[PDB]
Amino acid sequence: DIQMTQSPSSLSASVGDRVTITCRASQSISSYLSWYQQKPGKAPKLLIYAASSLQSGVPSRFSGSGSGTDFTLTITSLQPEDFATYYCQQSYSTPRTFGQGTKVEIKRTVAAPSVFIFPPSDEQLKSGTASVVCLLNNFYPREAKVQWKVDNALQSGNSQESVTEQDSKDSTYSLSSTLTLSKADYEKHKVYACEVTQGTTSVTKSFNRGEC
Amino acid sequence: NLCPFGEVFNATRFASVYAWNRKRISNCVADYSVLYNSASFSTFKCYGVSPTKLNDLCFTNVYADSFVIRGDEVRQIAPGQTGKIADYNYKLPDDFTGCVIAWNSNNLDSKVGGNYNYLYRLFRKSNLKPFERDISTEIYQAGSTPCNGVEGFNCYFPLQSYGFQPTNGVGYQPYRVVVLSFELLHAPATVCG
Amino acid sequence: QVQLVQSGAEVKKPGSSVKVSCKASGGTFSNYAISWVRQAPGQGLEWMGRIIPILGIANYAQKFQGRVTITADKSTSTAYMELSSLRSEDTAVYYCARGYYEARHYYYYYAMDVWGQGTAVTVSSASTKGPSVFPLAPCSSESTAALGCLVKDYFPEPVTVSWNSGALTSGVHTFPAVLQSSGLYSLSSVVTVPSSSLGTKTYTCNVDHKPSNTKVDKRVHHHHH
């Protein structure tokens, strides 16, 4: 089996930029190399085949090159419609393995999240479950570490999170994390806190169950 | 009973060349001269016999082989020939005794956008023996690395469609081909001129 | 302008089989191979196998051999992918795609040029269930307030969320669902507003769960009660 490793995993760029994405194969694959574009909720689309040939009707700001193991996709004058995920695929031999993909994101200035913490509603508690929710609103860049602390004890394995796509207006991300406990476990503790870490800064928002 | 010849020449469906169709002509009145003036044939050539001197001969069996190829490949349906069709599809022997009959079928076999129903074998490890038929669909290993049933580098799907279109040049148009081999065996003759 | 039109979304129990269709329209493709590619949620693309319709020749990636079957009906120009012994890991969007196989078109090197729209297959032992909708309200002030709704314990996807019947859109974030350990889904939808406007204004999240024919409207109280 031929392995395809794409790099970088993601990159940030501005409209007008020249962007390069590389794909390395585990062996020489001649020109059995294709590039695909995919946008959220949509089927992949062919851009380049035979490593270098522009697919009919695809904009000429896309181009491919490569030799032996190393292949590159270049987008010369990046347009809004070009922010997407890009996949390489080898068709040299079965199985026709794809690279893991490269997400092209919109560059902007750093922005601190607004951090909000939500206690479980009375209504939910009356059903025997407690969901504690942490919102990180309108932040950049995407990378953030979100941790839960209950009476200063760090939690693991009892939280899940998700992140929105880049906002259309401001190009920021928002993150929601949910800590899940039984009513009984929730009622055992006082101080509930969500900590977010980006670079050299950590911010912790909390509430006291007893208070409000 | 007259020899069922109109069944072969006027069949609605014709075989792909790689999967060429054989019909055995049994004990019947073989009238060869009427056939030669039955339609406008682009090709009527015989090998060791005349169209008129056949009407004074007897054979054990007549075999009628039928298929479709493109116009510029008809030349290949002859003893001593080479090319994809003669090498890998349909081979006539060196000492062939029969006729080769062909006609343009562009009115019938060409579809708009292409008729991709007709196939020929592009690759084979060796040439066919006379009257050999190969219907296998094994991926052709041109490399040293094995093909795991999937086309790729050095691993080629062995068949290709003609894709006959009406606007195609004369050389690329479909032609229906009937080959009549004449057999003699140590058994009573059945088909007679 | 050949399109490939796939069958609708499917929910399936572990151990069962799914059969997905792929119909050529604005054409009757007979010069082409039909590949199947799948994409698990949040993950990459994975080639499953291909059929050569003309001769009904089908081959599969080692990973799927024994469980997958690709067929093609020549008259309808319809290809089918059947996957059996379904597991929750088989939850993915399944794509059919048209590509080349013939020496004439060698210069494509088997690239896939036209793709179907995809078929969402969900594999789970869970039953259809409408969501519970709970308020998200702070333990209360700042200049900015956040309110929202937690849409918990529903199956299957998707839910849609609006605010004030679509009249409040700015400051709204509706998050991707997460799949809980229970096999039920959960999402949050939030809005940010000035603290001043919390006085008169009301905030209602409108949750639509078509798979269970349930709609829930939830008035979000300004502060935690």
Residue numbers in the entry:
A (entry chain B): 1 to 212
B (entry chain C): 334 to 526
C (entry chain A): 1 to 140, 144 to 228
Task: Quote the passages of the study that discuss this structure, keeping the authors' original sentences.
The neutralization potency of one mAb, Ab169 (designated as LY-CoV555), an RBD binder and ACE2 blocker, was consistently and substantially greater than the rest and was selected for further development. LY-CoV555 was found to have high-affinity RBD-binding and ACE2-blocking properties, which translated to high neutralization potency owing to its SARS-CoV-2 spike protein–binding properties. LY-CoV555 had substantially (>10-fold) greater neutralization potency relative to other identified RBD-binding and ACE2-blocking antibodies, such as Ab128 and Ab133, despite having similar apparent binding affinities, suggesting a distinct binding mode of recognition. LY-CoV555 was observed to bind to an epitope overlapping the ACE2 binding site; specifically, 7 of the approximate 25 side chains in the RBD were observed to form contact with ACE2 (8, 24, 25). Structural information was used to map the portion of the RBD molecular surface that interacts with ACE2 only, LY-CoV555 only, or both. On the basis of the crystal structure, the LY-CoV555 epitope, which has some overlap with the epitope for Ab128, Ab133, and CB6 described above, was predicted to be fully accessible on both the up and down conformations of the RBD. An RBD-specific antibody (LY-CoV555) was found that binds to the RBD in the up (active) or down (resting) conformation and demonstrated substantially greater neutralization potency of SARS-CoV-2 in vitro relative to all other antibodies analyzed from this patient. On the basis of the structure of the LY-CoV555:RBD complex, N501Y does not reside within the epitope for this antibody. However, B.1.351 includes two other mutations at important residues in the RBD, K417N and E484K, of which only E484 falls within the epitope of LY-CoV555 (39). For example, low-frequency mutations that have been observed in GISAID (global initiative on sharing all influenza data) at positions V483, E484, F490, and S494 either decrease or eliminate binding and function, whereas mutations at V367, K417, S477, and N501 have no effect.
SARS-CoV-2 neutralizing antibody discovery efforts, including this study, have focused on targeting the multidomain surface spike protein, a trimeric class I fusion protein that mediates viral entry. Spike protein–dependent viral entry is initiated by upward movement of the receptor-binding domain (RBD) at the apex of the protein allowing access to bind the angiotensin-converting enzyme 2 (ACE2) cellular receptor. Upon receptor engagement, coordinated proteolytic cleavage, shedding of the S1 subunit, and conformational rearrangement of the S2 subunit lead to viral fusion with the cell and transfer of genetic material. Given the critical nature of the RBD interaction with ACE2 for viral entry, antibodies that bind the RBD and interfere with ACE2 binding can have potent neutralizing activity, some of which have progressed to clinical study.
